[PDB]
Structure 1
Amino acid sequence: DFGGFNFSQILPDPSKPSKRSFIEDLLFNKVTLADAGFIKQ
């Protein structure tokens, strides 16, 4: 009850395995990385 203001799209989403928000997921999807370097999985 934030006086009618909405923060759902920027607050964490518990459903996903990662606790990123909707917009954070959008940003991570948009930016593409290279040379992961994660035990060369």
Structure 2
Amino acid sequence: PPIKYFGGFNFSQILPDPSKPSKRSPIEDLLFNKVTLADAGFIKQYGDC
């Protein structure tokens, strides 16, 4: 719900943060920033220069 009042239980750290364009929670965003990945599945035509 938009109210997000659960009787004193604060879930702001686990629920999506709408401020970020990825809509990930603060904890999920932290987890993604901690893991380093170079072998991306993205198109890679931006090297050779």
| TM-score, structure 1 as length reference | 0.86
Task: Could you list the structure 1 runs, at least 4 aligned residues long, displaced by more than 6 angstroms after superposition.
Answer: none
- Following TM superposition, by how much is the alpha carbon of 1:18 offset from its aligned partner in structure 2, in angstroms? 0.2
Identity of aligned residues (%): 98
Q: Which runs of 5+ in 1 are unaligned?
A: none
TM-score (norm 2): 0.74
Report 1 or 2 for greater relative contact order, CA contacts < 8 Å, sequence distance ≥ 6. Answer: 1
**Which residue of 19, 24, 29 maps to 2:33?**
29
CA drift of 1:35 comes to 1.4
